[PDB]
Structure 1
Amino acid sequence: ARIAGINIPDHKHAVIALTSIYGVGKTRSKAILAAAGIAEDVKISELSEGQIDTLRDEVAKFVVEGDLRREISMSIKRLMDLGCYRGLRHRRGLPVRGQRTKTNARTRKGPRKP
């Protein structure tokens, strides 16, 4: 499938190679090992690209690392500002979810100090 990315698994077997890839759904990893489908013991180099080119057109529209570590930041833009929904809190450079999560931002954005 010659999939886009930054990293490769090194000597580990299937069930841990497939999830030490730098952004691939571990809860999914179970069904996707049977999707292709391949054994739990494959040290990934024996897939010869072509025993995974077998799910190619599906993985050509999935978020695998290079998007989840970068290009997904272009997906927020139509929610991102003041107005209605989701928000300006993303643009402003803060923690997004925690209790009073604006207040968290000492390290994040400039202060560090209490």
Structure 2
Amino acid sequence: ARIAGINIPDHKHAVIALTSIYGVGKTRSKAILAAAGIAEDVKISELSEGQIDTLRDEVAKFVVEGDLRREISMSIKRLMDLGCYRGLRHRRGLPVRGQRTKTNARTRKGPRKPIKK
């Protein structure tokens, strides 16, 4: 099929399309489509079948959320369980990789303490 056989987006020119397909951003999106010999300067729509059917396979190399995003998660879930000062800080849900806190947690945590309760 036209679409990548794993999962669904649609439309737009091929180059932007693989982070729409998912799990591969721009650097992999140029290189992966180019290795297959598939253009950036085309609609998703027009694709000759030898490019698409090969695209459905040439994708199959890389990311699918079903095991992968869960697995990359399960590595963190283990970290959250492991007994580390690095993971413990992932458990409480503050910034923990880079930052410290005067007032700097909205990116990680979403809101400040909210509402009337």
- Which TM class, normalised by the smaller chain length? 0.5 to 0.7
Deviation, structure 1 residue 55: 5.4
In 2 relative to 1, CA 33–109 (structure 1 residues): closer, same or farther, beyond 3 Å?
closer
Q: Which stretch of the first structure deviates more once superposed, 29-38 or 50-59?
A: 50-59
Which one has the bigger helix percentage? 2
Deviation, structure 1 residue 74: 2.4
Give the gaps of 5 or more residues in structure 2: none
TM-score by length of structure 2 reads 0.57
TM-score by length of structure 1 reads 0.58
In 2 relative to 1, CA 26–88 (structure 1 residues): closer, same or farther, beyond 3 Å?
same
Contact 1:4 1:66 in 2 (8 A): no
> In angstroms, what is the RMSD of aligned CA positions?
4.3
In 2 relative to 1, CA 110–75 (structure 1 residues): closer, same or farther, beyond 3 Å?
same
Deviation, structure 1 residue 27: 1.4
Deviation, structure 1 residue 113: 4.2
Alignment length (residue pairs): 114
- Cα shift readout 1:2-44 (whole Å, capped 9, x = no counterpart): 8789975554211122344443221122211212221222221
